[PDB]
Amino acid sequence: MDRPEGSEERTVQTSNVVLGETNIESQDIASKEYSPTWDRLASSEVSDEYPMLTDRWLFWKSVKWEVNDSAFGKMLVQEKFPQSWVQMDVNVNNIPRYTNIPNFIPFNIHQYMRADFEVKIYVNPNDFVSG
């Protein structure tokens, strides 16, 4: 910290959401990136796209891990993807609904769907821990 403001925070914008980061990332890609061609052979109905809704960085879970429950191989998250994320808005009976989250609103009126995904993991520790 050497400025009146703390220092410069990098910014990443998508749709109407802006994420701030301050450090150098760790990155990877599950498989080779590509543009699909055989999806057009599956449905004669025109495939709708809602980029301002879907290309939006959305907040998922927060999971709290403590020193007393942190062992080698401890699973902070084990979730079916993207099922668990798209179905994260449940009712009193733990039944999911696609009706409230704008990113998921197209899932309610369509039977079949496809997309590529990106997942960010944010941890904000102090200067004096290790893990």
Partner: protein
């Protein structure tokens, strides 16, 4: 011609893109019944004993 007569067509979506009768997804085409009729099938089969002969 009545057998293929299709009046007052009402089509909500465009047609489905072709695969050339399966040639795009599988390595071969399937467009003619004549080709299938050239794949052998059982015509007749039986067992014959000495008692069935002269």
């Amino acid at each position: 011609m009545e057998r293929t007569f299709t009046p007052n067509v009402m089509q909500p979506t465009p047609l489905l893109p072709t695969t050339n009768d399966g040639r795009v997804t599988f390595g071969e085409a399937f467009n003619d019944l004549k080709d299938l009729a050239r794949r052998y099938q059982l015509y007749w089969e039986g067992t014959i004993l000495e008692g069935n002969l002269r």
